[PDB]
């Protein structure tokens, strides 16, 4: 027989192969950092210094022949292509007429962006997240933010994945006009400019490649030379742990919606949709796309953008065209892809899209039932309430009344039910609607007792400015505080108030607040009670389920209540 091949491990990249090439120690344009191959190029060097070398080699993976070629003297390079990621026991055999001899087996890794080479992620979840047996039909969604791995120190292995059906990954930008990003300050706009160098306008990119795929996370077993790292490698490993989980990239959001206003021109939609198809071929752990245009018709971060006539038809066409594209991927891969969107629920947002048309293309609508009131002005109110609060004036709820100055309300008040009923009334199916819950509060200072028109209700007072605090308190920007910060700094473990705060609840609205009457600090948020109320509202209307913004800000209480309030329920999945 020929002499047995001896594999040159260091001449063969230590048998580490990847279908994706990712730049690691630089930051450049997306097309120069990320290169995907449908087939991995495998090259394995071996030698046969003694004896006879033979004529032909065969490569085996787990005892199955995967490649063959010619032997070239005493040193040979086996070169072949292979599509399926994984870890395999490789042998190389040399053959002639006399017989065959084979190497010892050695593990080869073929990395792919489905995580097929990875073991299930090891989790590190706060034990306050409890276990439930919610029916698998109901949506239990959350948004994980790319930048949460910095000061917020919240990583993929912290997510209570057994309590989630859908993870929406916030946020993938679109190259093009993005002045709104400058409102974040810091490096955000300039990082986008770098990502978009060499990229056509209206194509998607990764905003922060360090967070997405370069940073080594030791809890994930990464080392510097691992070929895929960051959040994305952790999501791939999470998908091996929980294969029925859906992970969906979120395009847009408040600061990254400016390019959508150019989708009135179909050419720009075509460019965008093609780029999304490429993205989903590159990053196989993703299961669809979520479009978070804030908002058709305007009213978002860009005060100079919005077209009430033309943006709705553009939105619908986008959905049409995305669903054509996703059907191409389902034909090509055999998988199921979802198309979703998060939408505004003020009457003035909903009136600018004919959702009876759009929703036929969509799996789910994540209704943004939060941010109804907040620190952008000095008017208290319930930011995430189901129904109209006591503080509202006569005819404010339904919009038929007049304000304190005698000026007509322009439409129904900002509540979750007013928006859900406008969507239902034009024919959006309940079982495609997902109701939002807030894992944060918004708040004010200066709401002292002398400003209240009803002494029992701080929502009738007036503010002097935003809530101020530190990042240790969960105050990452003025006027906004993580729920886990409200629980540590204002509620306490027994939920009866600490630090000078008192707890109250508007039973009509289904909305909690905490108020420090000495500082006039007032915070509107979702709590156990209001989230139970949202779950029972969702059961009563036959909504698809609940989702939450944003998962790093919870301590377990909000997601627990989401499942609590859904107990016993099932829903028809969209088909
Ligand atoms: C409201 C919280 C602030 N905020 C809201 N949206 C945000 C941010 C933010 O801070 N960054 C930082 C990106 C820098 C990327 C890189 C390559 O370094 C963002 O990208 N986005 C979308
Ligand atoms: C994340 C951005 C917060 N943020 C910062 N400034 C804001 C917002 C906000 O959310 N809304 C509400 C949007 C429309 C809500 C509705 C139709 O129900 C605002 O009006 N302004 C000025």
The number of residues in the chain equals: 575
Q: Is 549 in the pocket of ligand 1 (CB under 6 A)?
A: no
- Among the bound ligands, name the one nearest to the CA of residue 345: 2
Q: Looking at residue 547, what DSSP letter applies? A: E
- 403 contacts 411 by C-beta, under 8 angstroms: no
Strand 338-343 relative to strand 288-292, pairing: parallel
Question: Which atom of ligand 2 has the smallest separation from the CA of 419?
Answer: 18
Residue whose CB lies within 8 A of the most ligand 2 atoms, among 374, 377, 399, for a mutation test: 374
- Which resolution in angstroms does this entry have? 1.2
- Distance separating alpha carbons of residues 506 and 485, to the nearest angstrom: 21
Q: How many helices and strands, by DSSP H and E, does the chain display? A: 12, 25
Instruction: Give CA–CA dist 457/449, Å, rounded.
Output: 9
CB 362 within 8 Å of CB 326: no
- 3-state secondary structure at position 551: helix
Method: X-ray
Question: E strands of 33-105, at which residues?
Answer: 34-36, 40-47, 56-61, 64-70, 75-82, 86-96, 99-102
Domains assigned to the chain? 1-111 (2.60.40.10), 112-438+525-575 (3.20.20.80), 439-524 (3.10.50.10)
**Which residues are CB-neighbours of 276 under 8 A, at least 6 positions away?**
204, 251, 289, 322, 325
CB 543 within 8 A of CB 430: yes
DSSP line for 213-263: IIS--GGGT--TT-SS-HHHHHHHHHHHH-TT-EEEEEEE-SSS-GGGGGT
Among 344, 153, 172, 324, which residue's Cα sits nearest to residue 247?
172
What does the block give as tokens for 67?
């490649």
Ligand 2 residue neighbourhood (C-beta within 6 Å) = 254, 299, 344-346, 349, 371-372, 374, 376, 414
Residue with tokens 């995305």: 322
Task: Choose, from 294, 321, 445, 521, the residue flagged as catalytic.
Answer: 294
Nearest Cα residue to 205 out of 156, 151, 146: 146
Give every CB contact of residue 499 below 8 A, 6+ residues apart in sequence.
489, 490, 516
- Cis amide prior to 346 (ω within 30 degrees): no
The alpha carbon of 206 and the centre of ligand 1 are apart by a number of angstroms equal to: 11
In the annotation, is 338 catalytic?
no
Label residue 408 exposed, middle or buried (CB < 10 Å: 0-12, 13-18, 19+).
exposed
CA–centroid distance, residue 147 to ligand 1 (Å): 6
Q: Which ligand is nearest to the CA of 181?
A: 1
Coil vs helix vs strand at 74: coil
Closest Cα to atom 20, ligand 1: which residue? Answer: 188
Q: What is the DSSP letter of 373?
A: S
What are the angstrom distances between the C-alpha of 436 and each of 148, 158, 295, 368? 20, 21, 17, 6
Tokens, residue 377: 């002005």
Q: How far is the CA of 178 from the centre of ligand 2 (A)?
A: 18
Backbone Cα Rg of the chain: 27
Pocket test for ligand 1, best of 144, 184, 192, 215 (most atoms within 8 A of CB): 184
Q: Which two tokens stand for residue 485?
A: 């910060």
Is the torsion defined by CA of 409, 414, 415, 421 positive or negative? Answer: positive
Ligand nearest to the CA of 296: 2
Q: Residues near 175 by Cβ (< 8 Å), separated by ≥ 6?
A: 192, 195, 196, 199, 200, 201, 202, 203, 204, 205, 259
Give SS3 for 34: strand
């Amino acid at each position: 027989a020929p002499t047995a091949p001896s594999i040159d491990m260091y001449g063969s990249n230590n048998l580490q192969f990847s279908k994706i090439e990712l730049a690691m120690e630089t930051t450049s344009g997306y097309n120069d950092m990320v290169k995907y191959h449908e087939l991995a190029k495998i090259k394995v060097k071996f030698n046969q210094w003694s004896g006879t070398s033979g004529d032909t080699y065969n490569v085996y993976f787990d005892g199955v022949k995967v490649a063959t070629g010619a032997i070239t003297g005493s040193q040979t390079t086996a070169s072949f292509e292979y599509g399926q990621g994984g870890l395999y026991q490789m042998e190389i055999e040399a053959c002639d007429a006399t017989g065959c001899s084979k190497s010892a087996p050695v593990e080869i890794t073929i990395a792919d962006t489905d995580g097929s080479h990875l073991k299930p992620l090891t989790m590190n979840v706060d034990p306050n997240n409890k276990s439930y047996n919610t029916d698998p039909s109901i949506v239990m969604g959350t948004y994980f933010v790319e930048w949460g791995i910095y000061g917020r120190d919240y990583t993929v292995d912290n997510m209570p994945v057994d309590n989630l059906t859908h993870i929406l990954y916030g946020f993938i930008p679109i190259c093009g006009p993005n002045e709104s990003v400058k409102s974040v300050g810091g490096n955000s706009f300039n990082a986008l400019q770098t990502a978009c160098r060499g990229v056509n306008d209206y194509e998607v990119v990764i905003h922060d490649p360090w967070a997405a795929y370069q940073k080594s996370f030791p809890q994930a077993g990464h080392e510097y030379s691992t070929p895929i790292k960051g959040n994305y490698a952790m999501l791939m490993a999470l998908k091996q742990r929980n294969p029925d989980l859906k992970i969906i990239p979120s395009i847009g959001g408040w600061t990254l919606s400016d390019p959508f206003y150019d989708f009135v021109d179909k050419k720009n939609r075509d460019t965008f949709v093609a780029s999304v198809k490429k993205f989903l071929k590159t990053w196989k752990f993703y299961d669809g796309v979520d479009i978070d245009w804030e908002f058709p018709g305007g009213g978002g971060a860009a005060a100079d953008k919005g077209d009430p006539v033309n943006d709705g038809p553009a939105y619908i066409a986008l959905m049409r065209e995305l669903r054509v594209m996703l059907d191409e991927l389902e034909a090509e891969t055999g998988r199921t892809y979802e198309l979703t969107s998060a939408i505004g629920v003020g009457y003035d947002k909903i009136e600018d899209v004919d959702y009876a048309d759009a929703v036929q293309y969509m799996d789910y609508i994540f209704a943004m039932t939060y941010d109804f009131y907040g620190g952008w002005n000095n008017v208290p109110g319930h930011q995430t309430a189901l129904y109209c609060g006591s503080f509202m004036r006569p005819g404010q709820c339904d919009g038929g009344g007049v304000d304190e100055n005698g000026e007509p309300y322009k439409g129904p008040a900002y509540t979750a039910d007013n928006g859900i009923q406008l969507l239902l009334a034009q024919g959006v199916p309940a079982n495609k609607l997902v109701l939002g819950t807030a894992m944060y509060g918004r708040g004010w200072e200066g709401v002292t007792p002398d400003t209240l028109t009803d002494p029992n209700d701080p929502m009738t007072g007036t503010a002097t400015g935003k809530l101020k605090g530190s990042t240790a308190q969960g105050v990452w920007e003025d006027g906004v505080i993580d729920y886990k910060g409200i629980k540590s700094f204002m509620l306490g473990a027994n939920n009866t108030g600490i630090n000078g705060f008192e707890y109250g609840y508007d039973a009509q609205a289904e909305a909690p607040w905490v108020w420090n009457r000495s500082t006039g600090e007032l915070i509107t948020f979702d709590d156990h009670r209001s989230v139970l109320a949202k779950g029972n509202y969702a059961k009563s209307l036959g909504l698809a389920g609940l989702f939450s913004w944003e998962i790093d800000a919870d301590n377990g209480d909000i997601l627990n209540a989401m499942h609590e309030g859904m107990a016993g329920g099932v829903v028809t999945p969209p088909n």
